[PDB]
């Protein structure tokens, strides 16, 4: 009945969407792009999607953006554990994933650390306002470029190797349909 913990709650679904929210967002999926994409996936594949947010160890606090990899080690470990848990708990699931702002740093840090076998189960990843875009040359490290789509709005300065938050950083509602479409196409 409540959202964002559907991998931990079970039952397994054919599609598991794992999402890391932006700094300051409450809850597991957050309150912006994470639910927007989750809900689009559920409309397109009714009854086939589990949405799982990265939390609560990932606290989405502002200061963590300045740490080496752009988020906390705890957040990266939590996300990495959820990818591993999807594959072991639900061997038939196909994973799609995403993040927003700091959550994109969580995704990059976690996915780059996964084995090839678990990476192969992750069919697509959408990154809105990717805070590691410059640092990672527009992809996730140690993971295929063609499985990632980055949404960096014009003038969203966090994609330029800064932590400056400007208005285009909040313009991603208009990209959530494209993002859902990309994830569905990868599935």
From Swiss-Prot:
Keyword Signal appears in the UniProt entry: yes
Disulfide bond residue pairs: 12-90, 38-51, 152-159
Assembly and interaction partners: Interacts with hadrophobin rolA in a pH-dependent manner.
Any Pfam family: Cutinase
Applied use: This enzyme enables the fungus to utilize the biodegradable plastics poly(butylene succinate) (PBS) and poly(butylene succinate-co-butylene adipate) (PBSA) as sole carbon source and could therefore be used in plastic recycling.
Tagged with keyword NADP: no
Record note on pH: Optimum pH is 9.0.
Impact reported for residue 6 to S: Reduces the affinity for hydrophobin rolA
Inducers of expression: Expression is highly induced by the biodegradable polyester polybutylene succinate-coadipate (PBSA).
Location relative to the cell: Secreted
Control of this protein's activity: Competitively inhibited by the carboxylic acids butyric acid, valeric acid and hexanoic acid. Competitively inhibited by the dicarboxylic acid succinic acid. Competitively inhibited by the alcohols propan-1-ol, butan-1-ol, hexan-1-ol, octan-1-ol, and butane-1,4-diol.
Record site: Transition state stabilizer: 23, 102
Catalytic activity, as annotated: cutin + H2O = cutin monomers
Taxonomic lineage from the root: Eukaryota, Fungi, Dikarya, Ascomycota, Pezizomycotina
Function text: Catalyzes the hydrolysis of complex carboxylic polyesters found in the cell wall of plants. Degrades cutin, a macromolecule that forms the structure of the plant cuticle. Recruited by the hydrophobin rolA that undergoes a conformational change after its adsorption to hydrophobic surfaces such as the biodegradable polyester polybutylene succinate-coadipate (PBSA), which results in condensation of cutL1 on the PBSA surface and consequent stimulation of PBSA hydrolysis.
Any one GO BP annotation for this protein: carbohydrate catabolic process
Enzyme active site: 101 (nucleophile), 156, 169 (proton donor/acceptor)
Name of the coding gene: cutL1
Thermal dependence of function as given in the entry: Optimum temperature is 25-40 degrees Celsius. Optimum temperature is 35-55 degrees Celsius.
Any one GO cellular component localisation term in the record: extracellular region
Protein name: Cutinase 1
Family annotation (SUPFAM superfamilies): alpha/beta-Hydrolases
EC number: 3.1.1.74
Cross-referenced InterPro entries: AB_hydrolase_fold, Cutinase/axe, CUTINASE_1, CUTINASE_2, Cutinase_monf
Alphabetically ordered keywords of this record: Disulfide bond, Hydrolase, Secreted, Serine esterase, Signal
């Amino acid at each position: 009945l409540t959202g964002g913990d559907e991998l931990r709650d079970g039952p397994c679904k054919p599609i598991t969407f794992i999402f890391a929210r932006a700094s300051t967002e409450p809850g597991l999926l957050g309150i912006s792009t994470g639910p927007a994409v989750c809900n689009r996936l559920k409309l397109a594949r009714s009854g086939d999607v589990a949405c799982q947010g990265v939390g609560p160890r990932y606290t989405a606090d502002l200061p963590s953006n300045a740490l080496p990899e752009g988020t906390s080690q705890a957040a990266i470990a939590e996300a990495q554990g959820l990818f591993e848990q999807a594959v072991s708990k639900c061997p038939d699931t196909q994973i799609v994933a995403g993040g927003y702002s700091q959550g994109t740093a969580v995704m990059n840090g976690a996915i780059k650390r996964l084995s090839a076998d678990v990476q192969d189960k992750i069919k697509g990843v959408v990154l809105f306002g990717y805070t590691r875009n410059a640092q990672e040359r527009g992809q996730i490290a140690n993971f295929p470029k063609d499985k990632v789509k980055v949404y960096c709005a014009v003038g969203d300065l966090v994609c330029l190797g800064t932590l400056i938050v400007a208005p285009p950083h909040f313009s991603y509602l208009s990209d959530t349909g494209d993002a859902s479409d990309f994830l569905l196409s990868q599935l």
